[PDB]
Enzyme design. Structure first.
Site, PDB file in Angstrom:
ATOM      1  N   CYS A   1      38.982  10.013  13.864  1.00  0.00           N
ATOM      2  CA  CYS A   1      39.099  11.089  12.887  1.00  0.00           C
ATOM      3  C   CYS A   1      40.512  11.201  12.336  1.00  0.00           C
ATOM      4  O   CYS A   1      41.457  10.834  13.020  1.00  0.00           O
ATOM      5  CB  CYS A   1      38.675  12.403  13.544  1.00  0.00           C
ATOM      6  SG  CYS A   1      36.882  12.539  13.697  1.00  0.00           S
TER       7      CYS A   1
ATOM      8  N   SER B   1      29.423   7.295  10.476  1.00  0.00           N
ATOM      9  CA  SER B   1      29.858   7.027  11.843  1.00  0.00           C
ATOM     10  C   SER B   1      30.766   8.061  12.478  1.00  0.00           C
ATOM     11  O   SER B   1      31.165   7.872  13.620  1.00  0.00           O
ATOM     12  CB  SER B   1      30.587   5.706  11.886  1.00  0.00           C
ATOM     13  OG  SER B   1      31.709   5.796  11.056  1.00  0.00           O
ATOM     14  N   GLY B   2      31.123   9.127  11.780  1.00  0.00           N
ATOM     15  CA  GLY B   2      31.710  10.278  12.473  1.00  0.00           C
ATOM     16  C   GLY B   2      33.189  10.525  12.290  1.00  0.00           C
ATOM     17  O   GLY B   2      33.820  11.233  13.112  1.00  0.00           O
TER      18      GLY B   2
ATOM     19  N   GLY C   1       0.762  -1.272   0.000  1.00  0.00           N
ATOM     20  CA  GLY C   1       0.000   0.000   0.000  1.00  0.00           C
ATOM     21  C   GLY C   1       0.783   1.308   0.000  1.00  0.00           C
ATOM     22  O   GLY C   1       0.221   2.380   0.255  1.00  0.00           O
TER      23      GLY C   1
ATOM     24  N   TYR D   1      33.266  14.096  26.383  1.00  0.00           N
ATOM     25  CA  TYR D   1      33.745  15.139  25.480  1.00  0.00           C
ATOM     26  C   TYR D   1      32.603  15.886  24.765  1.00  0.00           C
ATOM     27  O   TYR D   1      31.628  15.271  24.324  1.00  0.00           O
ATOM     28  CB  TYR D   1      34.771  14.552  24.464  1.00  0.00           C
ATOM     29  CG  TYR D   1      34.235  13.815  23.206  1.00  0.00           C
ATOM     30  CD1 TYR D   1      33.685  14.529  22.122  1.00  0.00           C
ATOM     31  CD2 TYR D   1      34.341  12.413  23.068  1.00  0.00           C
ATOM     32  CE1 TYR D   1      33.215  13.880  20.977  1.00  0.00           C
ATOM     33  CE2 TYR D   1      33.876  11.761  21.913  1.00  0.00           C
ATOM     34  CZ  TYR D   1      33.312  12.505  20.872  1.00  0.00           C
ATOM     35  OH  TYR D   1      32.834  11.918  19.719  1.00  0.00           O
TER      36      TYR D   1
ATOM     37  N   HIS E   1      39.838  16.668   9.822  1.00  0.00           N
ATOM     38  CA  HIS E   1      39.556  17.919  10.510  1.00  0.00           C
ATOM     39  C   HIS E   1      40.711  18.579  11.254  1.00  0.00           C
ATOM     40  O   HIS E   1      41.756  17.990  11.469  1.00  0.00           O
ATOM     41  CB  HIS E   1      38.349  17.734  11.427  1.00  0.00           C
ATOM     42  CG  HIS E   1      38.645  17.142  12.771  1.00  0.00           C
ATOM     43  ND1 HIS E   1      39.090  17.898  13.839  1.00  0.00           N
ATOM     44  CD2 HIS E   1      38.442  15.890  13.254  1.00  0.00           C
ATOM     45  CE1 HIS E   1      39.186  17.127  14.911  1.00  0.00           C
ATOM     46  NE2 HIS E   1      38.803  15.901  14.583  1.00  0.00           N
TER      47      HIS E   1
ATOM     48  N   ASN F   1      42.841  13.603  12.269  1.00  0.00           N
ATOM     49  CA  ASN F   1      43.494  14.837  12.761  1.00  0.00           C
ATOM     50  C   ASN F   1      44.580  15.364  11.804  1.00  0.00           C
ATOM     51  O   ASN F   1      45.496  14.633  11.458  1.00  0.00           O
ATOM     52  CB  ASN F   1      44.121  14.613  14.144  1.00  0.00           C
ATOM     53  CG  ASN F   1      43.081  14.346  15.234  1.00  0.00           C
ATOM     54  OD1 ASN F   1      41.942  13.951  14.959  1.00  0.00           O
ATOM     55  ND2 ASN F   1      43.473  14.551  16.477  1.00  0.00           N
TER      56      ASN F   1
END
Length: 334
Positions: free
Chosen positions: A281, A258-259, A176, A245, A263, A283
């Site tokens: 990350c 997922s982050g 539907g 944090y 950066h 860095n």
């Protein structure tokens, strides 16, 4: 004098993707009128040989129509039908990434995110014309009940056109759930930017069409919180970002749902190129982050090698390329 309508008096579930027609043999159509049950006339028009009439606007979900036709010729005749169109349980509204007229890297995949779970994946895939120039073979893999991706076997050649046409108006997508409207996107594939990093060196090496043009030292994820290995597709970016944090962070070019971002990390320059000090990350220095912010576009690749972490999961994602072509081409409709 014979009238023939392409719908039947008392029919139900008439499709709204198709027009209604009325034709006549033994003569010629005189007048045909069609009106919804609130009275509003629906537009249609008779063809230049007076023998077929068709609707010109599309019908709406959850309506009733009455069509009256007569034909002159033998002599006089009449027809009558009242019917209902598809009466959907749930409208679903697709969206397409990337957006219309975007220019994107060679790892961009074609997303189609629905706002409702799609019971019938096969119908959803059928409803999606993707047109590539120069052409290249691709296929549909679903990452979950709402989002379907489409990519080729290998990365995109530069300057490819990709036209995505999601055409779910009138398409029953199982149990539907019908499309609310159609949506399209045409985008092009830009320069082949591919960045690379081996946990041996911890140096991020950015290629532009197979020729290096920047390097930067990165501190990746701790043993305990490692950066995943494999191919990442770049997505969003942000001049600033709170991360939860809880702290502010600049020039974040995203690599995974997922982050995991490239950066700006001044607090850890000492470590960049030497030891992994982050929770996942890449860095880098404020100046090098800002460069990565300004010189890559959505759809550009980053590849990771020899970290302690697992492979980035395929359905993540952003992780699309990590799935082997064999399996992906098989898809997961059933």
């Amino acid at each position: 004098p014979k009238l023939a309508m392409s719908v039947k008096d008392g029919a139900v579930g008439v499709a709204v993707d198709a027009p209604v027609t009325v034709t006549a043999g033994e003569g010629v159509l005189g007048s045909v009128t069609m009106v919804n049950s609130d009275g509003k006339e629906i537009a249609g028009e008779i063809g230049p040989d007076g023998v077929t009439w068709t609707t010109t606007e599309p019908l709406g979900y959850d309506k009733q129509y009455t069509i009256n036709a007569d034909a002159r010729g033998g002599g006089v005749a009449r027809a009558n039908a009242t019917f209902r169109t598809q009466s959907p349980d749930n409208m679903t509204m697709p969206y397409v990434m990337p957006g219309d007229g975007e220019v994107v890297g060679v790892g961009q995949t074609v997303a189609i995110r629905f706002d409702e779970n799609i019971p019938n994946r096969a119908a959803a895939e059928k409803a999606i014309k993707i047109t590539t120039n120069p052409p290249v073979e691709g296929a549909f893999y679903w990452l979950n009940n709402r989002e379907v991706r489409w990519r080729p076997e290998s990365f995109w050649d530069s300057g490819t056109s990709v036209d995505v046409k999601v055409n779910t108006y009138g398409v029953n997508l199982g149990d539907g759930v019908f499309g609310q409207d159609n949506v399209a996107s045409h985008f092009t594939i830009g320069d082949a930017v591919i960045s690379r990093v081996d946990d041996t060196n911890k140096i991020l090496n950015i290629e532009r069409n197979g020729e290096i043009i920047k390097t930067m030292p990165t501190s990746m994820g701790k043993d305990k919180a490692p950066t995943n290995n494999g191919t990442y597709i770049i997505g969003e970016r942000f001049k600033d970002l709170i991360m939860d944090y809880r702290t502010k962070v600049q020039y974040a070019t995203q690599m995974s749902y997922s982050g995991i971002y490239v950066h700006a990390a001044p607090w850890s320059v000492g470590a960049q190129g030497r030891t992994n000090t982050s929770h996942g990350c890449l860095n880098v220095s404020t100046a090098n982050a800002k460069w990565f912010y300004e010189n890559t576009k959505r759809g550009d690749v980053v590849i990771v090698s020899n970290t302690v972490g697992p492979v980035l999961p395929g359905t993540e994602g952003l992780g699309d390329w990590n799935i082997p072509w064999a399996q992906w081409k098989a898809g997961n409709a059933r």
